[PDB]
Design a protein around this ligand. Sequence first.
Ligand SMILES: Cc1c(Oc2ccccc2OCCn2ccc(=O)[nH]c2=O)cc(Cl)c2ccc(C#N)cc12
Ligand SMILES: [Mg+2]
Lengths: 401, 547
Amino acid sequence: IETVPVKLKPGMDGPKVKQWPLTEEKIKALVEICTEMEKEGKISKIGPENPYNTPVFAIKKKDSTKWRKLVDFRELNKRTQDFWGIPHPAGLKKKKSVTVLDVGDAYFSVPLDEDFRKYTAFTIPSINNETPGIRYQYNVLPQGWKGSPAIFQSSMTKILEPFKKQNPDIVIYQYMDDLYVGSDLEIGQHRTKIEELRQHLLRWYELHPDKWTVQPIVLPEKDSWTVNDIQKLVGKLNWASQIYPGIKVRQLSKLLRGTKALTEVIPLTEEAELELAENREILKEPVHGVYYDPSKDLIAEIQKQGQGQWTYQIYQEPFKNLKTGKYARMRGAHTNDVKQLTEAVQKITTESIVIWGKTPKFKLPIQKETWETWWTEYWQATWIPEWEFVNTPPLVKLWYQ
Amino acid sequence: MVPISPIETVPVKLKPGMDGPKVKQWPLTEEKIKALVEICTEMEKEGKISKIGPENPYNTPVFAIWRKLVDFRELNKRTQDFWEVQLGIPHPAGLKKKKSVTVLDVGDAYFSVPLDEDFRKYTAFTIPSINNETPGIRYQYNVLPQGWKGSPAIFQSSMTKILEPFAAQNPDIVIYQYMDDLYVGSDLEIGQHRTKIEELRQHLLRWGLTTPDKKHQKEPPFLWMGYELHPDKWTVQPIVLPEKDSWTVNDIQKLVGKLNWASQIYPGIKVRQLSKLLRGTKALTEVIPLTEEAELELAENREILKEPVHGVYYDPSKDLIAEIQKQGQGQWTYQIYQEPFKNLKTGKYARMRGAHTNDVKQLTEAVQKITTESIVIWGKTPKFKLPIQKETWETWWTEYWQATWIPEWEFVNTPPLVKLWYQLEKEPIVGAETFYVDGAANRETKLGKAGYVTNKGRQKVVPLTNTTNQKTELQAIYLALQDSGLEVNIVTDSQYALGIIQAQPDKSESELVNQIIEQLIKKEKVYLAWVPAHKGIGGNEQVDKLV
Ligand SMILES: Cc1c(Oc2ccccc2OCCn2ccc(=O)[nH]c2=O)cc(Cl)c2ccc(C#N)cc12
Ligand SMILES: [Mg+2]
């Protein structure tokens, strides 16, 4: 009920960002939604004296036909001053199960600092530039802004205090408009406890982190090897030598001596088998000196494997993976690569939020124009990460398969 | 006297850390002075301006051309940024056909809207008196000054605020707002329409806004922003293409611009051979001759621009269809229509700047472009007709390493058809000869060697002058392709060459790459394997080309 003063970073003017074109139904959805919000004092129309603009579009969350409004607050977030810090709950990723809740509606109660409102300006665009776009600015705390949860930290604490004092074994984390709840209960007991917590939040996405882990480098086990087999093996081991110190491939390379046919079977020598075994033993161990640096950006790389299979790696320094995984989940995406990539980026970002409490910068195996054209059509998340586009095919593809 | 409704002013500030303009008034002739005195007298009588005391430090230069001209450039440099919604303009192909349409141009646009009082003191300017033997006459604005930075945005916002309730009360008519002009359209009867127009201009008159009293000064066809707007159709204003035996860079820029502008309704317009001459630009004076390709291109452009072509308006009840054709040399053309032979509009797409590429990628890009344009214009994505088989696209996106997508589309057979020219094997071929290839070059002498050894004993090493490592490594693969059967396995250690071939170009700027492609096309099965260099891998012979 009391507004806390909020400023920007020194030497930084408010965000001016081009609104991108929207389809007719999305525009109508936004018109209805923003009309309703205007009737509720959440937003207000503004004049031309406001130069600032932030992008906005429309989506549909999971199991809902209701159009939701999403604001791309990235530029404003990076231009908003740093808000100070609660140490990340490292026990959250160690819990058996974690449920994510949408506590966004709670932000619309708290008013926003009057002097800052001109920076949260957005525009519902028109088709064919026929009429000037409808301009709004936020009056209350906007969803998607990094300042909103930081301001609502005290309130949220006071609300979740009895539940925390009730179940100390339940880890509660907060990121943006989402509330992460980690526990070790049974799925039924889990869902009932979640109903309890949500009604506890009313009167005022099952995700199991244990089923996901890191992944090792495995080598084939064969009775008979071909020249091609051994060439691929030597390639993969040579690649892996950039990560593991003691990898050697000379005894295996010794087998390829001469010019043979790729399909010709080569019996392994005892030295070769020994070397391969030593390499296995080396690969079974974790990676030397791999640490997390909170001052460094997290980088995610994604490779398309085909048949709905995708691999990914989160790291900071090259060849120092903090996390690796393989998203192969198939829901309705069978005929669409971009949908798969979008859902994969979302899941990876979520995992990254649970583990480190911040989103990684992506390197997408897609052309900029394609992605830019289609990614909003499949995006159900409240936050948005940063990304870039790799135009050169990586050789390491089948080395992560 | 019936009171005109009050128009609330927009608060305006100067850029932070800046103060209002102080600029020395230019010396004027006595004639100019008299003229400006008369003009500013009638303006003061009209309430547009007001005399101010000596207190005001700020000043703006005024000129006479009689018509006055206040040069607000400095104030514009010192005035705050505003929200300009004028980015983009309505495209005629996006309009929905209406039985009755009216154009209203408001007279005294900026002079009808009041200015924020607290800012008026910054719009101060002085008229030099005769012989400068009396203090110059001081004035400040009370309304939006012509030439000011903030006038259009404020005027437009005011206009919208005024127009909103009438539009809310009249859903059966549609109003488009553009600068100093309003465009009203309806499917009502002509009498009812004229009536509602009278109602509208009355409603505007309530706030003190004047529209043409006579039969509205503009009747169809409407000439607007290079467009010709007719009742049942739209087109562009007639083309003017200069013909001179000596061409300059600027002339090429103008020509390209006009051709591009013409290409939105005239199908088949090409601008590559004329855009290639715009390399090494920024010199506006020059003489650039044209190739036979360019001359024939411009002649074909004169051939298409020979007879007029009309686009139609948009009907929401009918599907939106875009059809694409390949023109060659990275050029693509497309037509957007609903009824056959009746295009809503047309357009073209040119491939980006790259060393390698294939047809399918370019097609994808074209689809993306058309899609964005269509969302801008009609607020929806059209269905596509593409010169590519379903099977081809299937194979492509299933085997492509990048993620890729096209919206709803169907195969139209209108050659040239986009196809995949070659496909590499996923596994080694049984019974096929195995060519281990390698190439290396001396960094200093630019001398190198490229060649192969095979499992059957076939060998070759070729010496090369003026070459690099990458060139020799490509050359080796090329040699392997040349001297091998319809099915071949190829082993290389070059991540470069493998990278190039895995990108699957059907065309390249490097002749060697193109010849490799031409070799691949003739092949039945090709398996391309890779190994690390200098690992002592047998069959991989760096020593045979390092001599
Ligand atoms: C005249 C008119 C418009 O008209 C329309 C205004 C509102 C709604 C729908 C309109 O047009 C639907 C299509 N159409 C068009 C012309 C015609 O004669 N008949 C017709 O059906 C719409 C626009 Cl952008 C115009 C822009 C510039 C000028 C000028 N000068 C006039 C315009
Ligand atoms: Mg080599």
